[PDB]
């Protein structure tokens, strides 16, 4: 999962 | 009754009125995005608009988006710090009327  | 702050001869509205900010996440929080399916928020927003734009008032559509993101998504990460996390979108409305995309 990508988001920092 | 009568007052100094009401029933103005010249009507004005706040310059900040009629704005709606649909935030993907709560104040101060991370916003999650799937590197393959897109962000949880946009995925959900489009889905709810496609299904309810010709049926519900905008705030009610966004409320469905809040529920979809909050219940159906949870992060997965090899890094414990970013694993099993949740997200709740944040609707910020300064609108003064109901909003329907149809008429």
């Amino acid at each position: 999962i990508e988001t920092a | 009754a009568s007052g100094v702050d009401d029933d103005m001869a010249c009507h004005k509205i706040p310059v900040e009125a009629d704005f709606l900010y649909a935030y993907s996440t709560a104040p101060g929080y991370y916003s999650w995005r799937n590197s393959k399916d897109g962000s949880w928020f946009i995925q959900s927003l489009c889905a709810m608009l496609k299904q309810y734009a010709d049926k519900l008032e905008f705030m009610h559509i966004l409320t469905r988006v809040n529920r979809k993101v909050a219940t159906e998504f949870e992060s997965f990460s090899f890094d414990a710090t970013f694993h099993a996390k949740k997200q709740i979108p944040c609707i910020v409305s300064m609108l003064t009327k109901e909003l329907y995309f149809y008429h």
Partner: protein, 146 residues
Amino acid sequence: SGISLDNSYKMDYPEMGLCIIINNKNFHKSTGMTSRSGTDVDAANLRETFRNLKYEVRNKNDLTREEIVELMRDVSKEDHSKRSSFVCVLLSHGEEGIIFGTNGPVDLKKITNFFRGDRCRSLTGKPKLFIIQACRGTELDCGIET
């Protein structure tokens, strides 16, 4: 005529309005910001979604902080008289109150001020929608079992 209630925005103008999509996927190496994989999927989904709602969709990819500001300024300078509303979708990295251009930050307030009721008269009294996909900080929600 009969009883008139103004509880809903007038959305039957000739045009629904513009839907500006700012899609920032690639950032300048100098910033070290990571590419936002999957954002193109969001941009495409939004384009189709708002297209079906009859909005005039305009997509912009990888804009610098300067280009974001110029774009918003130019758009706010257009004549929205025949448009019912305005929509702007921001897809990028961010922090509380900030959205990132490819080379630096842009205060959301800077972007939204262009559309203030007193600065964009052709949108006064009309709904101005800003959809923001970006972090608003670094807090993590561990959730709770139901």
